[PDB]
Design a protein around this ligand. Sequence first.
Ligand SMILES: [K+]
Ligand SMILES: [K+]
Ligand SMILES: [K+]
Ligand SMILES: [K+]
Ligand SMILES: [K+]
Ligand SMILES: [K+]
Ligand SMILES: [K+]
Ligand SMILES: [K+]
Ligand code: NA
Ligand code: NA
Ligand code: NA
Ligand code: NA
Lengths: 328, 328, 328, 328
Amino acid sequence: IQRYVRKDGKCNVHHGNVRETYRYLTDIFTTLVDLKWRFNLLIFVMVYTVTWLFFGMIWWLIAYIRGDMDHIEDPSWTPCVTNLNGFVSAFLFSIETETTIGYGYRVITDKCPEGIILLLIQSVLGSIVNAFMVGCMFVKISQPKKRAETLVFSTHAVISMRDGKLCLMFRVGDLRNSHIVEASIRAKLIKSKQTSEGEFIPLNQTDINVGYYTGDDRLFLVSPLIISHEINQQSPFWEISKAQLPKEELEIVVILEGMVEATGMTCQARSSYITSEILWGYRFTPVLTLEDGFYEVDYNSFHETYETSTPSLSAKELAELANRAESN
Amino acid sequence: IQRYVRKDGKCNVHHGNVRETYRYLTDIFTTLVDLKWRFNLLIFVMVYTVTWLFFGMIWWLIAYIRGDMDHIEDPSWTPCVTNLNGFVSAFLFSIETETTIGYGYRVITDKCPEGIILLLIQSVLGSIVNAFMVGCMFVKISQPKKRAETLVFSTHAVISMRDGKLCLMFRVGDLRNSHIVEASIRAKLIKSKQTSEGEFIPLNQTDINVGYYTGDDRLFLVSPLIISHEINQQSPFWEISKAQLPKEELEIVVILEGMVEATGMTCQARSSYITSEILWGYRFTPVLTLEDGFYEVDYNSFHETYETSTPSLSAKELAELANRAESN
Amino acid sequence: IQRYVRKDGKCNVHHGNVRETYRYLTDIFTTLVDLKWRFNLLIFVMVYTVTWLFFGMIWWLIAYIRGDMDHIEDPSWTPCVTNLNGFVSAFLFSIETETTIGYGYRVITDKCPEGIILLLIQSVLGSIVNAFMVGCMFVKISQPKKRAETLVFSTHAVISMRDGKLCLMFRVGDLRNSHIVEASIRAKLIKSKQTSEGEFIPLNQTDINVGYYTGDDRLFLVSPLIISHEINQQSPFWEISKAQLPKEELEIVVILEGMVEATGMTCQARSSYITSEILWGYRFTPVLTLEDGFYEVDYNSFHETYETSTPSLSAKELAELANRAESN
Amino acid sequence: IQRYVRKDGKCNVHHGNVRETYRYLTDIFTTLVDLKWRFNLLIFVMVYTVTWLFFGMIWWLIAYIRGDMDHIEDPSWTPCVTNLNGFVSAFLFSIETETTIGYGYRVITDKCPEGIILLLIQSVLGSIVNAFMVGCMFVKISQPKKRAETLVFSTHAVISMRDGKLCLMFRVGDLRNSHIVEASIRAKLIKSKQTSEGEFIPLNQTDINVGYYTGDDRLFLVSPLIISHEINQQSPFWEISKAQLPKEELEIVVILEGMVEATGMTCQARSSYITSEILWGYRFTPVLTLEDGFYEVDYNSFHETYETSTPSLSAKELAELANRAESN
Ligand SMILES: [K+]
Ligand SMILES: [K+]
Ligand SMILES: [K+]
Ligand SMILES: [K+]
Ligand SMILES: [K+]
Ligand SMILES: [K+]
Ligand SMILES: [K+]
Ligand SMILES: [K+]
Ligand code: NA
Ligand code: NA
Ligand code: NA
Ligand code: NA
């Protein structure tokens, strides 16, 4: 069954039938950083080869017009660049000059104006293109979207009781000794709806509260946590009986985001629960122990859940019954 | 008709008559990154040429004072830099030394003090200016203000009903497979007003609510969305009849902002609706379909709107009539 | 009269008598980027000179132990680095090898083990120190704290009436065609106070509201704005008569912050008003005009204020009188 | 006694028993930047040595297949790279070509195809790996987590009275002339609890208010501050008598975060108070003085606290007594 968000973040959406493609070329940098690696390497090689070959051709041209080929042996002919005979020899001079290697078996003389003004232009353009390419490679290597590989979520969430209130709970944890600076979490409910006038919204997004009003959703993440949402008169689950649950077709998306510590960039991680990942009347299992001055986690029970007792009735009915019996 | 914000972001404002221009030189870096390209290239070329020519002149001077010109042929005269005769030859030594090419047909000897202390200063200044220029070029290539080329807004917004409440709606969508991290939206109303005391504010900015109180304006953008603002007793549209609308002269600005994914920089996108982009009694057209495991968008109907039935009366009159008839 | 914040941001506070100075060396990078320029250049020169001289000494040592000095003329003695006789000659080899120039009049041979393993170490350390220094220079050139040079505030603020409510107003404006992304503003009141128990707080900081509750302080800055604070029952000015004002000794600080557009860094700007910058019964002067399709600003009247009529009574007395007379 | 957070930030938690280690290799960059220095240097050396040795071997191979070894003396044999006899000589050519030094005693000729296509590949791969390594080193040198070395907290917090209200107070200060841009503070209470149904949460995190509702926790940090939390009907200390305090086992964590000024990265600082750092009936000591136009701080009394008079009764009892006596 389709789910519109996979269990690891990838979305099932296919952007098709766009008529304005020239936008993809107005911001070419983003497009470059977005491709795969097999294509980035190919583009680097092509750009460098073209840049070298162009200046090789112009060097050979300057040599040819002046008349250096006709005098390849005359000593009384101080030429332009020394030891430059054919095409393949003039091709090597460009490589040795632009990449700054400069062996020195073929070197430039000082009786050849417009040679210096070609050399300046070559150095400047070399520097520019070099900067562009190395910057692209570095940015593609050090992006933050990778940290989300070690921010484990949990499988199926649970619904249970907490001192007279129904709640919906799930669990989240990290895996490295580093820190996520300024972490925060939110959750959305996705389900189709139809207004009373006739409109039909395919995928309506509603927001559910996990502590936005009291500032309790800026969490401090060291040990595995348990996020919980209370079912009051504003929660979309305000009346969902136990037997009523498996019939509905809804989905919960969960988003956690914060800054990486070493650099200062922002990362985001996502997940989803559909209808078969919501168990009624369960609890998680503790994972913390104390040993000689260190708390010890066990990511062995991180997904494990056990069963307990819980009423089977909607929150609305529970509240109505409690208020009727506490005043009768 | 002037509009104070064009349909793509550019503003119609002309900063004139400034008497303190030296500020533009206290933060020269911003000014450099702000210019066009035709001028950036010219400035790069000029800076590099001056830097090379200065040290060329000082090299020739050192050579001249010591007395190397008078002895261009004497073998018993170990000079300073070898094979350095005229101005144009001493100009090439600076280029080959600063850019680190170093052919080696003209090389420095070891009987010439103050040559080494010139060489150190040259290397250090070369490194500094090189860093400055390449940094400027890279920053100008990789700025985030470009991503806003693929964050399409919609043309004319609409006003219609939603289960007994008037609302004002518009639509927003993306075009790439990437993600905007931590997106958010806001909107402002611009219209001239005059207080009861006599003051006259030319362009008064008021804020309209799109979900700031319930944290519902931190949106999760994958598929094209429909942002809506409800017209309650606090909205500036609290009494605007249908026939009354075309007479007013107001404007709505819309701002969306968030972080690019690959890098970690912030981008912003804007738009506007004046008075002829607000239709009364219309709806948008759905664009989502389901195909074998993928949802399919069609940016073919993205701007398309159709017509439906809607009362023609201000929100205040609707509420008054409903409350009078639901209690009579 | 001291003011604890100057009219351009600098603060009058002198951190003295610190006993733990080794902290300033645990984060040496911040300390480097914080110094002046006259000292940064000196440190660059010193570091580079020491790095070159050390390896020069070790090269000469390797040459000496092996016995190359005793045979400066023997042809049947393939030595280590060719044409290396004295100290000053071995000093140049280090410069030419580390900075990658490599003339080639003194070149390394292939009969000299531990020469290659010295060359590797030299290349690696050169690369590291080069990276460190160029990074420091670039960061010091491109910091954002400079943009605040073109974010003009206004001189003396004013107090006047707005449709039956006292308000306190000041003005803020920009000077460039760029944009501040995600701007925001806040203000604090600084004044000494003494509790009823006996404590004495020298500089107590209180916050004043400029629109935090309604999200109206996220401003959209193109044309010069007028920020205003309303004097209700919670404002520290809840009873300040006209004649009572010049006797008090308080201060208002104003802070505006947001992101630069080209890069993605955050900048902050500050100012202050003491007791003689608060005029009672004045208004600002408009600066906007319309010309053929462009709005025109005039930073000629940006500071100009004129005079008008206003009651001379505290807000508390105004409210009490109005409520007594509107019910008598 | 264990405390779950040390007095300087380090946490007592030991992540053990992970079964999915391949994640640590999907984002190798983070792992590199996370190691110590002794290992980073070793990895740099190993990578560079392998990269040079590989291409050295392939150069020697090309030379061998063509038949250059058999003719080490024949003049009528224009070879590939000149003066290339053995393994150790072909090893030096790779070093001189990749690092761009290029002495020129062994130089490449122009009768040797597939030499140029090896040279292109070498230059490109050299550039890539160079970029990667220098980027890693720079990022590890300039991270912001170091600034937190000069953001001193205070030792034991205090509990006292403030015009008829109990409050809990602590102090925070800086040490440099720079500025933290957009500072903010929060605090959490950590204590084990057990619900009424039977669940047992080992380390339950609750939030305590320090000014989140009124926007008073965005502080402006120049001089040492005193943060205070008021004990109303929602504070977890709503009934804690003086004699009752030493029996409980709770902990308070404190977190302060904001952006560094020179760069634009975010830093975080933490601390903790357990049960013996909470004194009942004390006050801090002022540190500000005025001298000829400068305020002078004295970080000599920064931790010093003195004693005063205070009732010994829970806040609930104080309120009940006051309300009963103010209405009897
Ligand atoms: K070089
Ligand atoms: K070189
Ligand atoms: K060279
Ligand atoms: K050379
Ligand atoms: K808020
Ligand atoms: K040579
Ligand atoms: K960089
Ligand atoms: K950043
Ligand atoms: Na962690
Ligand atoms: Na997208
Ligand atoms: Na502006
Ligand atoms: Na400070």
